[PDB]
Amino acid sequence: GSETQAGIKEEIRRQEFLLNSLHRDLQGGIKDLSKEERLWEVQRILTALKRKLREA
């Protein structure tokens, strides 16, 4: 159990970085299902991590 709120902070910087990026890959008449499933993975990781570490 790594109790590191700064952990998700550094992670979420990288995560949100690529998340926003691949989120935009869904825009422009693009038929991509990969980025969206991926952003939800990233989304749920950063969310669940910081919640399990600080909200517990």
Side-chain angles (χ1 to χ4, degrees):
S2 301
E3 187 186 276
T4 41
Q5 183 86 153
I8 167 271
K9 294 308 179 62
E10 181 177 81
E11 261 302 276
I12 201 173
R13 297 185 62 192
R14 303 196 304 151
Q15 292 189 29
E16 291 286 73
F17 206 111
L18 45 81
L19 199 165
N20 175 84
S21 185
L22 54 80
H23 192 202
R24 287 184 59 159
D25 284 272
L26 302 173
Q27 301 180 150
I30 304 300
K31 299 183 174 302
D32 186 292
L33 303 177
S34 193
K35 277 62 162 186
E36 191 170 282
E37 286 292 274
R38 191 172 297 197
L39 72 87
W40 203 55
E41 180 61 275
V42 182
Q43 184 77 209
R44 72 179 177 175
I45 294 175
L46 59 89
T47 303
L49 187 65
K50 69 194 187 73
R51 295 275 280 165
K52 261 69 180 189
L53 297 185
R54 189 238 287 163
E55 308 289 90

